[PDB]
């Protein structure tokens, strides 16, 4: 008494499945398989997934659902001292919402430019091109491919920007796509999860439709089999390699959505006795299975290119947006009925980003809705007052220097910020709140306590897991750079400012809570660490 609940729980599943499955699934996982020991990468991947990844994902879903409240109130309910974690987690998603919807806008901007039987990115003869242009991907950074130039020169107009200090004029063709996205988001998140959980039926399930079409499309392509070899052909030498276990650990962590408070928010709308743990691993499996399936969708087209298009495999296979907005479309244009694959592909990218942003924004709304009764009864005015903030600042990503702004938040906005956030999540839950109390909570929900396995991972494996990633993250750290452009020392300082801005709340809200509570130290401590009961 009293909270809105998911309609069918397939709403919740598809909502969480949708949130968990995004562009990273397509442009990252496959690259890591190609990069590390082929299919042998699955070994460290699975291991890191079992001990590190799922236990954290399981945690948030079980945590949010039980406490039955938004991210902030959830940690305010759990460990009021660490309630800053709820604050930190929510504004982490608040930050991401700025640069993230840009990729969907890109997807739509490509979706708009994709109506024709002549695709613009297959040509080096166009107005925006360069004498250095290639028909397809090349080794030399100086010479961009044809599809690469289209993305950089036309859509982004990134060449107009000398760096981050120069954003350049706004591209209003881009801002339209951005707003078109927010309109989709607003009307999806308008009435709350009631409408949200219903919308995810498309956004979450559409990609799988497209993935099948493209998977069938790719595997039929000449040399398609060759791509899978570059994909799944195992080198177990990588298994011994430390960097591979890091990529596995990192990917499994960032592939699942913990730390954004979305899972906390989403699962909280669940029925109290609704099985989470079943949903936890079901959602997790579908997520990883999706990437695995998508992996074939990607490298099937790559083997085609290396065969039919005469392109070096290492040149075409790439992570990040470069794969989706350049490499892949480049092969589609060569394919018969290109416009079809293009249209559905870019629609897939949008649908892959849409249900994700739903969760992210939902985490802010839900967290605030439970914390503040005003905006709770005020909603749909809030998402406007929110998304309006986004789009206004979103114009910064619609500029000619757009990607430069994007890439900055991408490496910062959800940073180590989420690592230390989730680390304090795991530590606050496993030690501060205790595993004895947590397993006790789930038993009262799903009917049975979490296995000895799960408790161990939360207490030990997870913390070192995040630590294993956070340490190896700082060990390979380099000042932010894209292409030949290196970000200035002030630009990096702002990125860290964004990273700290979240996590700083944890200690800050800790001191704020400590200063607000009377009594001696040990007294002031326990009172702040005493859970919402009663």
């Amino acid at each position, epitope marked *: 008494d009293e909270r809105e609940t998911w309609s069918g729980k397939v709403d919740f599943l598809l909502s969480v499945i949708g949130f968990a499955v995004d562009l990273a699934n397509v442009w990252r996982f496959p690259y890591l398989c190609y990069k590390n020991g082929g299919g042998a990468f699955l070994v460290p991947y699975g291991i890191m997934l079992a001990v590190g990844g799922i236990p954290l994902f399981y945690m948030e879903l079980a945590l949010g659902q039980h406490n039955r409240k938004g991210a902030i109130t959830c940690w305010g309910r759990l460990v009021p001292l660490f309630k800053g974690i709820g604050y930190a987690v929510v504004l982490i998603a608040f930050y991401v919402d700025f640069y993230y919807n840009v990729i969907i806008a890109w997807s739509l901007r490509f979706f708009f430019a994709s109506f024709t039987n002549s695709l613009p990115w297959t040509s080096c003869n166009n107005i925006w091109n360069t004498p250095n242009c290639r028909p397809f991907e090349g080794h030399v950074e100086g010479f961009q491919s044809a599809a690469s130039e289209y993305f950089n020169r036309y859509i982004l107009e990134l060449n107009r920007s000398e760096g981050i200090h120069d954003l350049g004029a706004i591209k209003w063709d881009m801002a339209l796509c951005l707003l078109i996205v927010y309109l989709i988001c607003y009307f999806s998140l308008w009435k709350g999860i009631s409408t949200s959980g219903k919308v995810v039926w498309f956004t979450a399930l559409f990609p799988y439709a497209v993935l099948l079409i493209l998977l069938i499309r790719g595997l039929t392509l000449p040399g398609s089999f060759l791509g899978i070899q570059y994909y799944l052909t195992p080198n177990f030498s990588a298994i011994y390699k430390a960097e591979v276990w890091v990529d596995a650990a990192t990917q499994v962590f960032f592939s699942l959505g913990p730390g954004f408070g979305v899972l906390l928010a989403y699962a909280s709308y669940n029925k109290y006795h609704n099985n989470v743990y079943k949903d936890a691993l079901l959602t997790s499996f579908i997520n990883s299975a999706t990437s695995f399936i998508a992996g074939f969708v990607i490298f099937s087209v790559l083997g085609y290119m290396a065969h039919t298009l005469g392109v070096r495999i290492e040149d075409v296979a790439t992570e990040g947006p470069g794969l989706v907005f350049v490499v892949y479309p480049a092969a589609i244009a060569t394919m018969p009925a290109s416009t079809f694959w293009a249209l559905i592909f870019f629609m897939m990218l949008a649908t892959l980003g849409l249900d994700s942003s739903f969760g992210g924004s939902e985490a802010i709304i839900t967290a605030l809705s439970d914390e503040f009764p005003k905006i709770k009864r005020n909603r749909e005015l809030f998402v406007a007052g929110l998304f309006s903030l986004y789009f206004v600042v979103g114009l910064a990503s619609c500029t000619q220097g757009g990607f430069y702004f994007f890439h900055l938040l991408d490496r910062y906005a959800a940073g180590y910020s989420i690592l230390v956030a989730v680390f304090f999540e795991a530590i606050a839950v496993s030690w501060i709140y205790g595993t*004895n*109390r947590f397993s*006790e909570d789930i*038993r*009262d929900m799903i*009917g*049975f*306590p979490p296995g000895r396995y799960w408790q161990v991972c939360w207490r030990f494996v997870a913390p070192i897991f995040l630590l294993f990633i956070t340490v190896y993250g700082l060990i390979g750290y380099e000042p932010l750079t894209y292409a030949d452009y290196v970000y200035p020392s002030w630009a990096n300082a702002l990125g860290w400012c964004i990273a700290g801005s979240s996590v700083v709340m944890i200690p800050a809200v800790a001191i704020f809570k400590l200063l607000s509570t009377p009594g001696s130290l040990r007294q002031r401590f326990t009172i702040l660490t005493t859970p919402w*009961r009663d």
Partner: antibody, heavy 119, light 109 residues
Framework: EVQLVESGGGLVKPGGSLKLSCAASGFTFSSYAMSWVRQSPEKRLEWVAE????????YYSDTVTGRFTISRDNARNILHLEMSSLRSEDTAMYYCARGEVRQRGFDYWGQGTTLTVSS | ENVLTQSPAIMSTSPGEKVTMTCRASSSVGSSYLHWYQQKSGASPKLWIYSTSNLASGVPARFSGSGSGTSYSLTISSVEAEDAATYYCQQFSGYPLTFGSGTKLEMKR
């Protein structure tokens, strides 16, 4: 191995109160949740109250609700049941059981302690 | 309250003959949330079948279970003198927790 010993109980005048205890051994008590299941002289099994591992979740049947208070000691591995304003209908042999996994039911029961409420 | 009624209440079977006892619930219960108990005369009840198909520790394979929704049944392949007792089903689907009417199995001679 697992041994549940239930103590207390006896004759109690209606309206009176009586405290019951279950001595648990052979397993970690703080891990498993406990439930009091009573059986009337007519051989009628009725779940009375359940308490979780930490004992922060308590469930009572509509029959004994508010009259009975089920306590827990994880240090001494002792499950109590605090009865108040007892009723003639409350006459039965109370059992101590676990009680942890809902999907597995109650795997271990005690010997039982007998309660008789009569004037 | 979910009311679990069992039947028959008193059942007679000679050793080796197959027997089937049923537990029908007023409300539907998760197949994993229903359990059976065997209470021998003057003995404390013991967990017999859990999650409706699953025998407990020490329970002979001669025992079996089935059903779903509001209808569950405990069955003995070939009954033995050892099997003479009163059998109680149970539902954990929701509180308050409830036990079946019970089925008293008596050997015929």
């Amino acid at each position: 191995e697992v041994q549940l010993v239930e103590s207390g109980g006896g004759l109690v005048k209606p309206g009176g109160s009586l405290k019951l205890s279950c001595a648990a051994s052979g397993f970690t008590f703080s891990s498993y949740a406990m439930s009091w299941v009573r059986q009337s002289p007519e051989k009628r099994l009725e779940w009375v109250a359940e308490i979780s591992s930490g004992g922060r979740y308590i469930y009572y049947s509509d029959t004994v609700t508010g009259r009975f208070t089920i306590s827990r000691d994880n240090a001494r591995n002792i499950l109590h049941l605090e009865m108040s304003s007892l009723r003639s209908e409350d006459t039965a042999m109370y059992y101590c059981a676990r009680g942890e996994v809902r999907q597995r039911g109650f795997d271990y029961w005690g010997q039982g302690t007998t309660l008789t409420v009569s004037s | 309250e979910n009311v679990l009624t069992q039947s028959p209440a008193i059942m007679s079977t000679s050793p080796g003959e197959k027997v089937t006892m049923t537990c029908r619930a007023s409300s539907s219960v998760g197949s994993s949330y229903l359990h059976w108990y065997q209470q021998k005369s003057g003995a404390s009840p013991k967990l017999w079948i859990y999650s409706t198909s699953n025998l407990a520790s020490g329970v002979p394979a001669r025992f079996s279970g089935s059903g779903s929704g509001t209808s569950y049944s405990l069955t003995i392949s070939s009954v033995e003198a050892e099997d003479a007792a009163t059998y109680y089903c149970q539902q954990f689907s929701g509180y308050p927790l409830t036990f079946g009417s019970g089925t008293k199995l008596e050997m015929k001679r």
